[PDB]
């Protein structure tokens with residue numbers, strides 16, 4: 653499955669729900685959206701803390717993203733951390749819009765796509781690909 657499309661559909665949906673029409677395998681997209689909503693409710697303190705402590709500006713966004721992503725996957729990968737990675741990118745995009753720095757969304761989407769293609773892709777494929785994530789979540 654194309655990771656770039658997965659990132660784009662995911663971010664696009666999150667922003668559209670804030671009235672922001674961003675100028676940017678259906679089961680996979682819907683499943684990821686649901687798993688991410690579940691993650692953010694089940695781990696609300698983490699979600700809420702990250703959201704309020706970003707201190708996001710165009711000068712720091714890339715460094716904050718790199719730092720958090722390296723910390724997230726430090727002890728290895730699992731599907732829950734992959735969902736957390738998407739929700740973190742979503743928090744970054746959402747905060748960028750809230751702070752009137754919406755152009756950052758494009759950079760964020762690229763960094764997410766790159767990290768998936770360069771660092772998560774092998775793990776994902778070794779686990780059977782996104783079909784495995786779909787099965788695990790249900791469908």
Ligand SMILES: CC1(C)CCC(c2ccc(Cl)cc2)=C(CN2CCN(c3ccc(C(=O)NS(=O)(=O)c4ccc(N[C@H](CCN5CCOCC5)CSc5ccccc5)c(S(=O)(=O)C(F)(F)F)c4)cc3)CC2)C1
Pocket residue numbers: 687688690691694695698699702720723724730731732733735736737739740743785786788789790
């Ligand atoms: C260092 C740093 C600061 C870095 C940055 C950062 C951070 C801070 C803010 C933000 Cl915003 C982002 C990141 C943190 C914060 N940290 C990040 C990691 N966090 C994790 C917490 C739990 C797991 C886990 O549990 N991982 S797991 O064991 O692999 C597993 C288990 C169950 C399910 N899904 C089930 C679904 C069951 N069905 C539902 C449908 O009805 C049928 C039954 C439950 S919902 C569900 C439950 C959990 C996850 C997703 C969905 C899935 S999953 O959905 O991915 C699936 F199923 F595999 F697909 C996978 C992995 C990591 C904890 C908090 C730390």
